[PDB]
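Tutorial sheet, problem 5. The six components below are modelled jointly, 1260 residues in total.
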Amino acid sequence: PIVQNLQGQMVHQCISPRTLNAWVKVVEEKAFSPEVIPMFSALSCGATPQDLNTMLNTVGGHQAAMQMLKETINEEAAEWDRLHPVMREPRGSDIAGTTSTLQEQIGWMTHNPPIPVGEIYKRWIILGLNKIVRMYSPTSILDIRQGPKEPFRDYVDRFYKTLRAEQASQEVKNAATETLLVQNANPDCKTILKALGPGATLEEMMTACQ
Amino acid sequence: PIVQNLQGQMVHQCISPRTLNAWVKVVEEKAFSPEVIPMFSALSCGATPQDLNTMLNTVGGHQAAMQMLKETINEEAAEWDRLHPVMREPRGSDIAGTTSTLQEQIGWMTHNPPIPVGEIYKRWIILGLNKIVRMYSPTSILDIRQGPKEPFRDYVDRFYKTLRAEQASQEVKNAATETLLVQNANPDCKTILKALGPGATLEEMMTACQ
Amino acid sequence: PIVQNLQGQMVHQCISPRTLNAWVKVVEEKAFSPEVIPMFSALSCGATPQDLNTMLNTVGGHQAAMQMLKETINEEAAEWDRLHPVMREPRGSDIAGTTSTLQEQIGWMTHNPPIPVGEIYKRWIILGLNKIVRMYSPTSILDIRQGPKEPFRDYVDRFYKTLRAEQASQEVKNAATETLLVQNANPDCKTILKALGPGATLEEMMTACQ
Amino acid sequence: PIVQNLQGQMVHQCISPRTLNAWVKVVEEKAFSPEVIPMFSALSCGATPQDLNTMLNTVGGHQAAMQMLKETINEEAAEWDRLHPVMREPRGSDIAGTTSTLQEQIGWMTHNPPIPVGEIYKRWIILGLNKIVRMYSPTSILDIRQGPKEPFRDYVDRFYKTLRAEQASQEVKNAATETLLVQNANPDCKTILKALGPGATLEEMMTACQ
Amino acid sequence: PIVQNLQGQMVHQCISPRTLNAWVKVVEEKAFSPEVIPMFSALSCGATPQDLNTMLNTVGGHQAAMQMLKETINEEAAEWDRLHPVMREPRGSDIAGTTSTLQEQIGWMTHNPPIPVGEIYKRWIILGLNKIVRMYSPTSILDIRQGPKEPFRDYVDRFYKTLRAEQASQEVKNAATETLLVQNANPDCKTILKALGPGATLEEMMTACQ
Amino acid sequence: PIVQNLQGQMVHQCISPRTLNAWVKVVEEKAFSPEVIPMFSALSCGATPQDLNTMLNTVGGHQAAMQMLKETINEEAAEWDRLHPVMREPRGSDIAGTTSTLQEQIGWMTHNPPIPVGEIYKRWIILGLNKIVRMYSPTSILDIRQGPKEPFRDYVDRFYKTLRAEQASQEVKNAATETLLVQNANPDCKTILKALGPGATLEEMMTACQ
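Model answer (structure tokens):
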């Protein structure tokens, strides 16, 4: 990835074994849980398209997901080529890092103004990963219900984990979300939440059901 | 996080995978014990709101706590907007890192005088974490007493651990707290402490009951 | 390898023990899976031919594969010698790091215009590794068929992993490959895929068969 | 901690996760053995009071020890305030790191002449740690006596470890301690040591009694 | 070892603990398999004679091998003294690292032109290690015969591993080597090798014997 | 330890936790085997007396050995004081690091001409460690005997390991050493060794009995 040196300029540096190990271990252990995407966005700080290609190709399993990612990147490159018809300006395949040289990528990312091919490739990969995570949700939100003896903490944590997996975003707060949350609880906490009144925060609901 | 180079200028640095792994392991293994807050304040030395959001979103489980944290940050941002009506001035959401880009944050944190958006966001996150840790107390302070044969050392350890968890702070010393400690002590140690009289430090009580 | 310091010139630095340990661990663990080649291209970023020889000779086991690699490198060196009739210009063996000193390799890797002996040797080694990986595939692509109760997701995983093993590249799918994919599926999923019609993406096939 | 950069200036640096993990592991595993204090003085080299507070607060267990440490710090700060009647001059709490900011601490630590607030706070913490270590001695010195078949080396190891714990120092050997050491030895070794006469060092005693 | 700094000169650096740990672990775990020599030549890149002595004296076991290494080094030093009749010019014992100081070694390795005492010492140590590796071959190559149900790949693995051990070098290719390889195979593969015809490469033999 | 910065000057640096962890682990695991002294020499590269004291105090067990080391240090300091009757020149105590501040030590180790208190202190510590390792020898050299069927390799390994321990030095080859080596060999090997002829090298003996 491109970093900043002590002279004050952007100079390319090789990708480190630590970053590669971190990414491979994360993908192998956490599978495609929703928090992998922030991990991908953090490990790819200032990455060139070649670095992102290395990170994607290094993954051993989940080849169906990687094929979906490849198809999504191709679709995004086609859309970019349609929206941007014609140093040489980049094309979709050049941004994808399959028809361009590392030197050209570094020249683009250091140009004034910069042409962040790495950022665009990261956005395409992030769209692909969002689709993959949304497809790999283990269960639907409508089937999350508190057990007969399950504490409110466990039920709420499972409900919000599922709702993060489904919508592919942690920020899943909605009025219908709260209604579904209160509906699926056990009757003991259901009555308390019903009597708590509208507009209550999740903190107050957890305190009341503690 | 913004760091200082050998030249002597504040520049951005990519967030290291080592810090991310440390924070993830700490949250996974420490649950929400009161010692997590100093760890978060240490790992985030000089971080920007983007880095804080990365560190928060990378947490795997405990989604209810993250939702409470998000709601608390929203409340604090609303309060900040109310107290500050209207480079572009940072709004509550911009400080929270929802509608802000990296360049804007770095310009804010390198301005003269600096607008410490990172510090403000860290304060809001610290408030949310304090509330979460307080909520995560396994038992109240009034429910802990020394056992029939428990050494006074372990009893004081448990008492002060519970006291730290209850108030989400370590410095919770009070005359009422000392009276509670001597009240719940074993009858032999209670008699010894009563004979020792008021004004005795914790060290003297520990020495006497040895 | 050769890296750039703050003075502004390429300088040679010793190969770090971290890279060597990572490469040895990768070879010992993953055997010759198709993802070894991206790891080799990543760990050897800017490595002079001496470093490539160090990385190749450090591998303990799999001596047949290393002998095939040696023969392939010799053949490529002979072709290079034939195509290039005769600072001294490099030869095939000089590029292969057998009859060249470290100083000569540094000079070749740093002149203007550069003679990327490291990159040429890397391409030869990657060709040899492609041959090895293609030879080491456990199964043929015609032996992959979905089981009576195996999910379509796992069937696609196996199919595309084996396909990457054979062609030694991720870009291995084709129209005939898509026909093979739909033909080898279980009849229940085969009917759905047939009803989905031509032009269907892998995403739609995965969604429909669930 | 404040460290000297390559340009030759004393600049503030964030405290690395490795030091924090090392200190946490040392406290967690070694309890409060006498060797912890040298580890504390080595890990916290050049630290400002904020870093010392972070390193103290990060400890999870042993809350009674931390309470005693806080009491000792308060006593020493009161003494400092008494002895110093009144850039702004530091106070007891300012040195302790509770009513001071990072900028003020850095200014004090880098003023000419320096006001070593970090060193003074470290001395107070060392006093507290010495008190805790002395309190946490499992056994008294007089209770170390050689077994019927116990080797002399292990007996001397136990004796000197116990003596090290008590006086909160390693250089605790003395003529009275030498007499105590020769008193509790086994009669077979006791007669040999008595015949060896005064003036014999520990090496000669160990050699004679093997 | 000696490295290159940002000032552009050659200056000394202490041998890092990671290098020492890597060397000790490699030597202990891998015994004296032929891949140790590439590891030794990679870890000691640019090492001074004192660094080589530190790396050799740190090994715990295999003391007979270390004594043979010392004998070989002494013989080579005597030869060097014989071949060179007589800042002081180096002698055999100075390159051996027994009668030279670190300052003198650095002056030798940084003189104009450099007198690579480190490289000469490393060559002597490599000759000694080659002798030890040859002596540590578990079995003779003539006893390697393919099993009744052993795959030809595993037979080639064992054959070439043993042959590399015997010569302490990877260059074991020969017409007699190929004849010995084909003679020891099972008749089922021996007939196929005979039918393949002379002059075939190893890859063709592997593919035809599958 | 005092190291050289990029500007080209000697400045102090806090002892890194990696060095301390390595030193403590080695001392705890290997006990006082003769290979510890090279490790201590490597890890203490360029250290001040304060760093040497830090590394000595951090050792938890084996307090008898540490007391012997302290006695040896005191004796050497007394000898230094006698040999050198009285920036202030360093006395024995100041060299030992008990009565000298870090500023004085840095001023001493960076003066022109240098006064290497660290080197002298390391010499004293190495003398003490040699004495400790010599005392800690598990067995005598005369008791080293070959088993009836124990391979000659293991016999020579044990013999030279013990003889290295016996004299606290690896350079232990001698005429009497070889005489005892051939005297304690098994009769089957003794016949071959006797018929081999005087003056034979160790490699010839190993090959003859292999």
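Marking note: The first strand of chain B starts at residue 3 and ends at 4. Full credit if you identified this.
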